[PDB]
Design a protein around this ligand. Structure first.
Ligand code: NA
Ligand code: NA
Lengths: 87, 90, 90, 87
């Protein structure tokens, strides 16, 4: 998958955020204690990661502390060769 | 801290030691490297965007005329934030 | 520190929330969970062997009569060591 | 793979240990700064991990500091079902 979302926030939100991640269609996530927890979620699309982030921040970030980071893969260099069997 | 920048390099196995040395010289925090038998894949963590670009430019300029590979980068940006700190904590 | 004990659980997707709650209650440091569509795989880190066994026993006793799964553990032991410390460092 | 070796040691040994890992037949490794570096190596067999550890400690651990940890997977519980298409 070409996109990664990271959410660092208060431990109290663990179950509520895990449920958002499940409902989003994401294939999995990592969560670790880091008073605070850090989620990492890989997504096939940019939009899926943005939508998780919107749902979490709109629901919780007026009342709870947290930070959400996103990245999308950008190809910098490429050199490819293939033939009939290998393409 | 912001998450580390991630650089991924997929290329020919023969370049393993030369690329590992480039990664070390750049000041990267670390990397994973795996066979993916003819090919290897590096996933490299760097503190800054500039350090990841240094590795990418060094590898591609030196080798990508003669060897096959792909290099991509994932650099985190803040999308939402809500933080508090006081006398002991900032 | 010794590396964390690793517990891996592969089982049916429907148990996702019940197992995540067991992992949290046990005091584990964290976990990864991934679809592996019908099945999920947890990889869980725990500070102690006892904490990983607690999760394993809780999950298998509660669910493994009725649901399919496998649970395995990897607990690190020291094989070789050579360490030095002095006044500032021990 | 069912076995994991972890080596924590002095940064000066980075290239020498990476070369041992390559020569062992292992499929890959992770290495991170942790003055010190930490290697993680997954191996298909217990013997492969032990052999990496022996080679590193015999060569270096009289003169350099480090620690090497090993684990092998132990199945605790299992319940399997399959039919003609799925076994
Ligand atoms: Na709120
Ligand atoms: Na020595």
């Amino acid at each position: 998958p070409a996109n990664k979302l990271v959410i660092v926030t208060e431990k109290i939100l663990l179950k509520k955020i895990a449920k958002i991640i499940d409902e989003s269609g994401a294939k999995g996530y990592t969560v670790m204690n880091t008073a605070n927890i850090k989620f990492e979620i890989l997504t096939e699309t940019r939009e899926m990661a943005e939508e998780i982030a919107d749902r979490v921040a709109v629901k919780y970030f007026n009342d709870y502390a947290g930070i959400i980071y996103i990245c999308s893969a950008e190809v910098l260099y490429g050199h490819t060769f293939c033939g009939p069997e290998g393409c």
